[PDB]
Each structure stands twice: as C-alpha cells, then as structure tokens.
C-alpha cells in the first residue's frame, strides 16, 4: 500500500532541474528549467549518495520535490554529430594513400584495439 501510494503520487509532469550543493540541516538546493531556485527540506525519493552538483533530476511540477534521477543531456546538435549510419567505404577503396592510411590507423585504431603494445612501452599513445 505505501508503494502504490508512492506510485499514484509519481505521475509525471516532471520539472527537470539542476542540482546545487547539498546541505546537512542530506537536503538539496534545486535550480529549475524555469530559472527559479528552491530549497528542499528533504531531497525526496532519490538518495543523497546518488545525486551530485550539476545533475539532472525530475522534480514534482508543483511541490518541486525530487522524485526522479535523469541521464544527462548535452544538446540536440551534439547528438546529431553522432554517427548512426556507420558508412561503408573500405580501405581498399583508397588509392595511393597507403602510407597516410597506415599513419592514421596506427595513430587512431591501435590505441582503441589493444593498448597493450603501447603500455608495454610506457609511451603516451598519440
């Protein structure tokens, strides 16, 4: 019963908001997406150890208590910069550039692949 009372009290228009430094008298300060700051006598349904400054929390649309912890969102353009299509041009499709191809591969792919050949030497990979 207590959990379903929480559930009915967890309807989600959330006011996503940033966390600011926590206080003792364990309790949090919130800056809303509407650029107004609140203090919470108790943080809410999330635990203090999870939260941290500059976090994204979904709070109650009216009481502004924190009741959800959110994955950080950078920007729509930044996500648009991410490659999802994964293009297909092969290395064989590149002509004459074999030395440049080798340089780029050894600089980029090898640190991703192994990291053992570099660490066995102690060098910082490029």
Partner 1 sequence: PAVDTAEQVYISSLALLKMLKHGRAGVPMEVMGLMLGEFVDDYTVRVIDVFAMPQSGTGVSVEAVDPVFQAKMLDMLKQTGRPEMVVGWYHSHPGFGCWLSGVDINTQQSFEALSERAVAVVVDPIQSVKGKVVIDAFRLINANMMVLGHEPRQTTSNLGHLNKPSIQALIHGLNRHYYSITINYRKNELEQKMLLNLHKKSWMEGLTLQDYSEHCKHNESVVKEMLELAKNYNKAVEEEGKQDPKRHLEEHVDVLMTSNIVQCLAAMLDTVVFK
Partner 2 sequence: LQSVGQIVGEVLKQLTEEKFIVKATNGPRYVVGCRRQLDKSKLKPGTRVALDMTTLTIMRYLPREVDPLVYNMSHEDPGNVSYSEIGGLSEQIRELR
Minimum distance, C-beta of residue 73 to partner 1, in the bound complex (Å): 25
Q: Does 46 bind partner 2 (CB under 8 A)?
A: no
Rounded distance, CA 120 to CA 75, Å? 39
> 89-118: which residues touch partner 2 (CB under 8 A)?
none
Report yes or no: 51 and 22 within 8 Å, Cβ to Cβ.
Answer: yes
Rounded distance, CA 22 to CA 60, Å? 18
* Length in residues, the chain: 126
Nearer to partner 2, 9 or 100 (CB): 9
Residues that bind partner 1 (CB under 8 A): 5, 8-11, 62-63
* 40, interface contact from partner 2, partner 1, none, CB < 5-8 Å by kind: partner 2
Would you call 125 exposed, middle or buried from its count of C-beta atoms within 10 A (0-12, 13-18, 19+)?
middle
Residues that bind partner 2 (CB under 8 A): 6, 9, 18-21, 23, 29-30, 35-42, 44-45, 53-54, 59, 63-65, 67
């Amino acid at each position: 019963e207590n959990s379903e009372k929480i559930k009915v009290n967890k309807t989600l228009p959330y006011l996503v908001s940033n966390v600011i430094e926590l206080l003792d008298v364990k309790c949090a300060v919130i800056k809303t997406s509407t650029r107004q700051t609140y203090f919470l006598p108790v943080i809410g349904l999330v635990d203090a150890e999870k939260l941290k400054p500059g976090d994204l929390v979904g709070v109650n649309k009216d009481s502004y208590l924190i009741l959800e912890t959110l994955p950080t969102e950078y920007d729509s353009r930044v996500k648009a910069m991410e490659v999802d299509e994964r293009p297909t041009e092969q290395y064989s499709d590149i002509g004459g550039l074999d030395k440049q191809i080798q340089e780029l591969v050894e600089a980029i792919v090898l640190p991703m692949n192994h990291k053992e050949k570099f660490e066995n030497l102690g060098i910082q990979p490029p």
